[PDB]
Design an enzyme around this catalytic site. Sequence first.
Site, mmCIF file in Angstrom:
data_model
loop_
_atom_site.group_PDB
_atom_site.id
_atom_site.type_symbol
_atom_site.label_atom_id
_atom_site.label_comp_id
_atom_site.label_asym_id
_atom_site.label_seq_id
_atom_site.Cartn_x
_atom_site.Cartn_y
_atom_site.Cartn_z
ATOM 1 N N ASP A 25 0.801 -1.222 0.000
ATOM 2 C CA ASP A 25 0.000 0.000 0.000
ATOM 3 C C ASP A 25 0.844 1.287 0.000
ATOM 4 O O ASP A 25 1.302 1.758 1.045
ATOM 5 C CB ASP A 25 -0.933 -0.023 1.214
ATOM 6 C CG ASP A 25 -1.944 1.098 1.198
ATOM 7 O OD1 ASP A 25 -2.729 1.182 2.155
ATOM 8 O OD2 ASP A 25 -1.982 1.860 0.215
ATOM 9 N N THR A 26 1.010 1.880 -1.178
ATOM 10 C CA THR A 26 1.735 3.147 -1.291
ATOM 11 C C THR A 26 0.993 4.328 -0.647
ATOM 12 O O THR A 26 1.587 5.386 -0.416
ATOM 13 C CB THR A 26 2.018 3.496 -2.745
ATOM 14 O OG1 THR A 26 0.778 3.614 -3.463
ATOM 15 C CG2 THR A 26 2.916 2.436 -3.380
ATOM 16 N N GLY A 27 -0.301 4.161 -0.368
ATOM 17 C CA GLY A 27 -1.068 5.176 0.353
ATOM 18 C C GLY A 27 -1.003 5.074 1.870
ATOM 19 O O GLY A 27 -1.702 5.822 2.578
HETATM 20 C C1 LIG Z 1 -11.815 -2.043 -0.346
HETATM 21 O O1 LIG Z 1 -11.698 -0.800 0.351
HETATM 22 C C2 LIG Z 1 -10.713 0.190 -0.040
HETATM 23 O O2 LIG Z 1 -10.032 0.007 -1.041
HETATM 24 N N1 LIG Z 1 -10.626 1.272 0.723
HETATM 25 C C3 LIG Z 1 -9.691 2.356 0.474
HETATM 26 C C4 LIG Z 1 -8.790 2.488 1.676
HETATM 27 O O3 LIG Z 1 -9.199 2.970 2.724
HETATM 28 N N2 LIG Z 1 -7.532 2.048 1.561
HETATM 29 C C5 LIG Z 1 -6.534 2.088 2.624
HETATM 30 C C6 LIG Z 1 -6.270 0.638 3.024
HETATM 31 C C7 LIG Z 1 -7.537 -0.135 3.343
HETATM 32 C C8 LIG Z 1 -8.142 -0.916 2.366
HETATM 33 C C9 LIG Z 1 -9.307 -1.635 2.639
HETATM 34 C C10 LIG Z 1 -9.862 -1.581 3.913
HETATM 35 C C11 LIG Z 1 -9.252 -0.805 4.896
HETATM 36 C C12 LIG Z 1 -8.096 -0.087 4.613
HETATM 37 C C13 LIG Z 1 -5.227 2.776 2.185
HETATM 38 O O4 LIG Z 1 -4.695 2.280 0.960
HETATM 39 C C14 LIG Z 1 -5.355 4.243 1.873
HETATM 40 N N3 LIG Z 1 -5.528 5.094 3.048
HETATM 41 C C15 LIG Z 1 -5.662 6.477 2.523
HETATM 42 C C16 LIG Z 1 -5.482 7.544 3.588
HETATM 43 C C17 LIG Z 1 -4.248 8.171 3.736
HETATM 44 C C18 LIG Z 1 -4.057 9.150 4.712
HETATM 45 C C19 LIG Z 1 -5.099 9.519 5.559
HETATM 46 C C20 LIG Z 1 -4.881 10.570 6.613
HETATM 47 C C21 LIG Z 1 -5.429 10.411 7.890
HETATM 48 C C22 LIG Z 1 -5.228 11.386 8.864
HETATM 49 C C23 LIG Z 1 -4.468 12.512 8.558
HETATM 50 C C24 LIG Z 1 -3.926 12.633 7.279
HETATM 51 N N4 LIG Z 1 -4.136 11.675 6.353
HETATM 52 C C25 LIG Z 1 -6.341 8.896 5.404
HETATM 53 C C26 LIG Z 1 -6.534 7.914 4.431
HETATM 54 N N5 LIG Z 1 -4.471 5.026 3.871
HETATM 55 C C27 LIG Z 1 -4.592 4.796 5.185
HETATM 56 O O5 LIG Z 1 -5.677 4.609 5.711
HETATM 57 C C28 LIG Z 1 -3.342 4.816 6.021
HETATM 58 N N6 LIG Z 1 -3.296 6.114 6.684
HETATM 59 C C29 LIG Z 1 -2.258 6.926 6.583
HETATM 60 O O6 LIG Z 1 -1.248 6.668 5.919
HETATM 61 O O7 LIG Z 1 -2.355 8.184 7.296
HETATM 62 C C30 LIG Z 1 -1.271 9.101 7.319
HETATM 63 C C31 LIG Z 1 -3.235 3.705 7.072
HETATM 64 C C32 LIG Z 1 -3.484 2.356 6.403
HETATM 65 C C33 LIG Z 1 -1.801 3.720 7.585
HETATM 66 C C34 LIG Z 1 -4.197 3.874 8.258
HETATM 67 C C35 LIG Z 1 -10.423 3.639 0.062
HETATM 68 C C36 LIG Z 1 -11.537 4.032 1.033
HETATM 69 C C37 LIG Z 1 -9.423 4.792 -0.010
HETATM 70 C C38 LIG Z 1 -11.029 3.440 -1.327
#
Ligand SMILES: COC(=O)N[C@H](C(=O)N[C@@H](Cc1ccccc1)[C@@H](O)CN(Cc1ccc(-c2ccccn2)cc1)NC(=O)[C@@H](NC(=O)OC)C(C)(C)C)C(C)(C)C
EC number: 3.4.23.16
Lengths: 99, 99
Positions: A25-27
């Site tokens: 996960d690059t995100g």
């Molecule tokens: C099948 O569901 C998905 O694909 N869900 C995706 C999703 O949430 N992907 C997550 C991983 C995931 C997949 C499936 C179920 C649960 C979680 C990540 O790829 C993208 N997401 C995207 C994202 C990135 C940053 C933030 C954020 C939060 C607080 C402050 C600043 N940024 C929120 C969401 N990143 C984060 O949540 C990360 N957060 C992070 O790196 O925070 C610094 C975590 C993981 C370390 C918690 C979306 C809702 C974006 C479509």
Amino acid sequence: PQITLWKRPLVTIRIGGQLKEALLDTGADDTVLEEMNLPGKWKPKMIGGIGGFIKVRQYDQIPIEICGHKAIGTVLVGPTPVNIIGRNLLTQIGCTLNF
Amino acid sequence: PQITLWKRPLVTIRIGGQLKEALLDTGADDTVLEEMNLPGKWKPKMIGGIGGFIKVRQYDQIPIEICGHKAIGTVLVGPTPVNIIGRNLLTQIGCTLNF
Ligand SMILES: COC(=O)N[C@H](C(=O)N[C@@H](Cc1ccccc1)[C@@H](O)CN(Cc1ccc(-c2ccccn2)cc1)NC(=O)[C@@H](NC(=O)OC)C(C)(C)C)C(C)(C)C
């Protein structure tokens, strides 16, 4: 190797010598694993995703293998629906995005 | 280009004539942008991640230029914490993970 993105980029990881499937996960800033009873000291941490924050246990200097590539670093454990390999470990295995 | 992961993989996108920064996110099924106006009829939907579910507006067949590469696809609009380019559009621009 090269991993296309037609499906979720799930790969096999090893932690504590045991195998799990995890999302590359690059995100993700951090690496977050589904609830597991890992030994050792930890510290409470809050991490935020799309729907808000969850409580995790932060473990440090944990060896992991990702698709056969060794890494070591911080692993967060908590009520995630999916094991997530974040940028903290992806850099260690030399992973890049390319287009 | 080739993008390493010691920093968040943010890139400039063009959408509806406007420029924005967005995260190239291999852990996202969908593309989700912060609340904005887009032309056309949207469909209410819900998506989930870490922290739970949020309500979004689904717009179909929306052109976005992502770091100089054209895509036309589904874009969700809602209270996401960050602009996210997910796999639906990453595949369109020929993005892969490599290590
Ligand atoms: C099948 O569901 C998905 O694909 N869900 C995706 C999703 O949430 N992907 C997550 C991983 C995931 C997949 C499936 C179920 C649960 C979680 C990540 O790829 C993208 N997401 C995207 C994202 C990135 C940053 C933030 C954020 C939060 C607080 C402050 C600043 N940024 C929120 C969401 N990143 C984060 O949540 C990360 N957060 C992070 O790196 O925070 C610094 C975590 C993981 C370390 C918690 C979306 C809702 C974006 C479509």
